[PDB]
Design a protein around this ligand. Structure first.
Ligand SMILES: CC(c1ccc(O)cc1)c1ccc(O)cc1
Ligand SMILES: CC(c1ccc(O)cc1)c1ccc(O)cc1
Lengths: 224, 224
């Protein structure tokens, strides 16, 4: 089928471990530290992945940064959503960090994780494929609505290249549902809503000053 | 062309006036009172409009209410966006209530209105048509992601009926851009983001207790 889709598949990064500190007693502070630490190392891996997206690295450095600073949380959330598709009421942040409802309550994340679980429920019934996940991830990046884009036309062309790939993939692979591509695009609003709430939540955590955060994660929180 | 699109066009409600009280001195409280008063009367008109959407009134009353309680602010915002397309850096809440940048600052709405203006900018370059506006309004309602839907399959069928109409309209009317339907769907995330921020903002205003609000507007704020 589609080459952009095959290319995004081979560019998909390897999963990384959360590695919660086994010597630290369980608390909300430990869980939030673990999660922000994981997100920080995933953000490095995300920056490297985006350079494989056709056309992304030919944008100016400021434009590459604007897109990432708008989309980082959507990309992170789509990741845990996809890793969670075969589970039931659990969120697979990492193979060694799977959160159930009780752990979400203790971390103060019950409402945010419930919204992530709603994204999971929708993608399960739609039988979301890996091919579709990596394409939506790239589209989320290109369609992130940064207020600060220099070359608007070039960003809009990146959006069109990825949308075409999604259309081409669905036309060849899902002839039983000629509207599957649009259904996939219609999942993006709930992803944007959940990411908007998540960024504000962790920005509040940053202001309370009880959870240490690393440099890149703080940079992504401050850009917003 | 498409009958659903023609039907939504004739079902479009008449514009109403904001009628700011000419005896009241200008303040943030007056502007916010005017805006919430307008929104309250528009919400009544929106409930009546939705009964014209094919299939909507055959949903149970609880399901009709769930969709409206999720989408009300998106529908309101899409309205002012569309009324503003021929203007420059101004938001046409009503023919007698057009807000420029200075008035937004004084009302404490500078950041929210700037995001609404970003929606306007995108739809201007895309040359959004009235046919496309009324269809996206209906799709926003059907795709509002309520957590409380009883008949999930029936809501999903409503989504498919409206998506089909958008696809059919664009295929016949915009043969020069075979991906215009998807481009239109890809504007929905920024609309959902802006509405999420707007609801939280006016919920905070409700808690401060200095701006009187009417019954329906309060009901829509409390459901969230
Ligand atoms: C930012 C963090 C997060 C945790 C719980 C939320 O409800 C929202 C966000 C996170 C970390 C690593 C990921 O792979 C994905 C998300
Ligand atoms: C809720 C109110 C509003 C004002 C300013 C905002 O930035 C966001 C929302 C509003 C009232 C009437 C409308 O037709 C549309 C919106």
């Amino acid at each position: 089928y589609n080459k952009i889709v095959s290319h995004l598949l081979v560019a998909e990064p390897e999963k990384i471990y959360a590695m919660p500190d086994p010597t630290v007693p369980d608390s909300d502070i430990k869980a939030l530290t673990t999660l922000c630490d994981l997100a920080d190392r995933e953000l490095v891996v995300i920056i490297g992945w985006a350079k494989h997206i056709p056309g992304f690295s030919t944008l100016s450095l400021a434009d590459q940064m604007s897109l990432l600073q708008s989309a980082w949380m959507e990309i992170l959330i789509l990741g845990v959503v996809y890793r969670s598709l075969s589970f039931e009421d659990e969120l697979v942040y990492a193979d060694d960090y799977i959160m159930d409802e009780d752990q979400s309550k203790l971390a103060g994340l019950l409402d945010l994780n419930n919204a992530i679980l709603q994204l999971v429920k929708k993608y399960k019934s739609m039988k979301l494929e890996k091919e579709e996940f990596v394409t939506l991830k790239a589209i989320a990046l290109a369609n992130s609505d940064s207020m600060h884009i220099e070359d608007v036309e070039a960003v809009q062309k990146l959006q069109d290249v990825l949308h075409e790939a999604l259309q081409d993939y669905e036309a060849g692979q899902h002839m039983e549902d000629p509207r599957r591509a649009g259904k996939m695009l219609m999942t993006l609003p709930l992803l944007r809503q959940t990411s908007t709430k998540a960024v504000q939540h962790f920005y509040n955590i940053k202001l309370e000053g009880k959870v240490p955060m690393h440099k890149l994660f703080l940079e992504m929180l401050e850009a917003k």
